């Protein structure tokens, strides 16, 4: 009896977050207020097997 | 975006937007042989035969 087992597993794996919180906020005495905020969030992920 | 002028007037503006997506992708091939092959006897002719 001759017996051959190969396994081969490959994985791979890729994440990717950006996060930007850009604000601006005035404020006179009183008279003129002004507020402004941005926040932008991206997320990337990837996986691959084999 | 936040607006206050005279500090009576108030306006506000909030908006956001959200994108999710997704793919996935799996492929399997699975392949068997399975080959037999049994030999029992053998069988000959005798020489003084008719």
């Given at each position: 009896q001759e017996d051959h087992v190969r396994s081969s597993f490959l994985?791979?794996?890729?994440?990717?977050?950006?996060?930007?919180?850009?604000?601006?906020?005035?404020?006179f005495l009183n008279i003129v207020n002004f507020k402004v905020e941005t926040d932008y969030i991206s997320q990337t992920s990837l996986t691959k097997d084999y | 975006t936040e607006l206050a002028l005279f500090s009576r007037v108030n306006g506000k503006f909030s908006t956001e937007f959200?994108?999710?997506?997704?793919?996935?992708?799996?492929?399997?091939?699975?392949?068997?042989?399975?080959?037999?092959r049994n030999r029992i006897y053998t069988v000959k002719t005798t020489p003084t035969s008719e």
């Open positions: 994985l791979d794996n890729q994440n990717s977050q950006n996060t930007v919180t850009a604000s601006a906020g005035i404020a | 959200q994108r999710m997506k997704t793919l996935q992708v799996k492929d399997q091939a699975v392949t068997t042989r399975v080959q037999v």
